[PDB]
């Protein structure tokens with residue numbers, strides 16, 4: 048019964064739309080459709096801030112209200128916005144639906160007014176082991192981002 | 201001390217940045233810098249949805265949780281997002297700072313994940329005696345808009 | 354064998370890529386892939402100027418070096434930039450490939466450094482009985498545009 | 507011209523008689539639907555061919571209901587703007603009892619709000635008199651007789 | 665409130681009726697009444713295609729939009745159409761009510777226009793260990809099938 | 818990406834070569850180069866049969882897997898092999914590139930093993946109104962034809 052949407056833009060052909068649905072105080076369903084991607088897996092994250100005054104750089108780090116480390120969406124040691132990878136087909140198109148419970152549209156940890164970012168490289172899920180594997184996953188640069196806003200229904 | 205920001209973009213040269221700063225549950229400070237505007241007063245409103253899948257059109261009507269008619273920011277009978285006019289100088293720049301009490305960053309009426317819209321025309325503050333005066337003003341088309349998102353501090 | 358590309362952007366979810374191919378003094382082949390569109394036909398035109406200082410507005414009118422009225426790509430009585438309609442499916446995705454002779458990549462009428470615009474409405478092809486049919490084809494507002502640029506191969 | 511995702515469905519038409527056949531449907535993107543019909547065992551001559559509302563054969567073909575009619579208009583000819591969506595006119599069976607015809611229509615999409623997937627095809631006993639012919643039943647049915655064979659429109663590969 | 669029905673027919677005495685009811689976007693309630701069956705358990709699956717051009721064989725493999733291996737309705741690792749076994753009494757009648765969440769009547773994965781097949785042999789769920797166990801369940805031949813079609817109310 | 822070719826030969830000096838390209842479930846790109854033609858427009862069609870036992874006469878009518886009438890590539894109450902006109906220059910050369918949806922190289926309506934015919938006269942696109950306007954277009958005799966055959970890469 049609550050809904051949000053993010054329009055994803057950047058400097059390249061990578062652009063897309065992410066819709067969010069949440070019932071009850073339950074899981075959040077995320078419908079992701081992005082194009083222009085290099086075929087393969089891309090880091091896909093909900094970042095802390097809905098600030099685009101400085102391009103996608105101003106969206107900050109992965110949304111992490113539990114001071115925890117970077118992981119996979121399945122394992123209990125992740126950031127709230129650690130939504131893993133989205134995979135682009137041969138046409139650079141990634142269409143996927145993701146269900147997660149650390150990203151509510153309400154409550155103290157609402158991600159409303161926050162951001163989504165799709166990334167340059169594959170998320171190594173915090174096993175790289177890279178220096179950066181445990182903060183970012185190595186997902187690389189920020190290809191496109193958008194601020195999460197309220198939308199009808 | 202909570203703070204939010206909206207980056208305003210559109211179909212024209214008109215763009216700008218709006219920052220929001222709020223005390224406790226005190227009044228909200230709205231800092232506006234917009235460029236590309238025709239010199240003169242322009243309707244400046246906080247609209248209901250942080251949706252821009254269809255441009256500024258998807259941000260809906262003026263934010264109105266009291267279900268009242270359109271008027272001026274000083275009026276008793278006003279929309280919450282009815283922030284009146286902002287004035288552009290000869291260089292097309294409207295820089296102004298606004299304080300209002302119906303646009304909190306938290307609570308049952310939070311404006312996070314909603315939008316700002318700068319309009320084609322002067323807002324008649326519903327006294328115009330125009331068909332649209334009591335809903336719109338005659339604020340005209342949507343020159344630029346942005347989703348209100350969270351930002352540090 | 355020269356090649357060009359335009360990355361199509363705007364204030365909405367409407368995004369796209371246009372690639373252009375032309376050998377010597379032959380026809381020009383245009384691959385158009387746009388997403389985010391309202392399902393149905395949309396005016397798709399090559400406009401005179403590659404200028405986005407004023408959004409898609411500064412790209413001017415349809416590219417028309419033969420001083421003619423608005424028509425269909427098939428009509429001898431068309432603008433050079435009259436590339437007809439592109440049709441979006443139910444998911445809002447329109448992909449189409451077009452061959453034309455009036456939009457070369459070289460010579461006195463090169464379209465390099467000009468722009469592409471995808472439009473709000475159906476192009477009535479100049480046949481709709483409307484005031485705007487012979488200049489634009491109705492087709493409405495400018496959803497997204499991009500400057501046509503040179504690209505390798 | 508335009509790139510096209512191919513969408514496809516099929517109905518196998520069976521009934522109490524020798525009348526049986528196969529109907530395939532092709533639609534690219536959201537354009538018109540191409541319908542290929544091959545039915546056998548028919549009485550030579552024209553036969554009513556309609557897309558009926560339900561893919562329900564629990565009670566023989568009669569449970570497929572009336573003609574698919576999401577506009578609410580009366581029975582007419584495929585040519586007529588006075589149509590059921592499923593008003594596909596007549597198929598004519600030759601002397602060997604075979605009716606083979608190809609049809610293009612725009613009121614029978616395989617996707618969308620008016621999807622015909624999971625609905626049915628029915629070939630009928632008699633001639634469809636279209637919205638003409640002046641019978642009590644002409645504006646519902648087309649006085650098209652009984653239901654000889656029917657099938658549920660189902661998904662099929664590619 | 666959506667409802668569907670499949671009439672199950674085949675080469676032998678095996679015939680039956682399956683009605684499907686689904687409210688909301690949730691579990692599907694499926695009522696199965698099949699007769700002529702051998703007394704004992706028989707595999708009951710929702711197959712991919714509503715194609716019966718070549719008899720029940722044309723219905724394809726078990727409906728599997730998660731590209732996963734054969735399991736039980738209880739396992740988490742199943743085909744969507746993995747609805748387990750139905751057991752026929754000594755009179756050859758199998759009557760059962762079954763509820764599952766992977767067979768919606770609407771959505772990207774609607775099972776409308778697909779089919780049901782009741783099988784020759786017992787479905788070793790996936791975990792019996794045989795050649796075909798992780799594809800079919802060695803459910804054996806296809807005794808009767810029917811295309812899932814729309815029905816009133 | 819599949820590719821095909823027709824080598825076009827005939828009764829006169831008229832000869833030419835046609836190559837076909839088709840990716841995916843996309844359009845077919847047809848490259849046409851014919852010589853020996855009288856300057857002007859000439860009907861260019863994909864006819865039904867790849868049979869030249871009796872010269873071009875044995876290639877049959879225009880390829881028409883829809884039950885439709887003769888017309889023009891843009892208007893589509895047309896045959897699949899309705900490719901409009903090709904224009905010969907002063908030197909009798911017609912070089913043209915064509916992209917179409919009704920001539921796939923694969924699938925049930927493949928044009929592989931069928932033929933291309935270049936015709937004596939201009940195609941009237943279905944509009945003489947002439948006896949032949951709705952079947953052939955009054956394209957005249959068959960100047961040269963070739964069977965559409967598979968070619969590497």
Ligand SMILES: [Zn+2]
Pocket residue numbers: 109116117118126128129182183184
């Ligand atoms: Zn992280």
Ligand SMILES: [Zn+2]
Pocket residue numbers: 245262269270271279281282335336
């Ligand atoms: Zn107002």
Ligand SMILES: [Zn+2]
Pocket residue numbers: 398415422423424431432434435488489
């Ligand atoms: Zn024009």
Ligand SMILES: [Zn+2]
Pocket residue numbers: 556573580581582589590592593646647
């Ligand atoms: Zn009817």
Ligand SMILES: [Zn+2]
Pocket residue numbers: 709726733734735742743745746799800
């Ligand atoms: Zn299975």
Ligand SMILES: [Zn+2]
Pocket residue numbers: 879886887888896898899952953
């Ligand atoms: Zn023809």
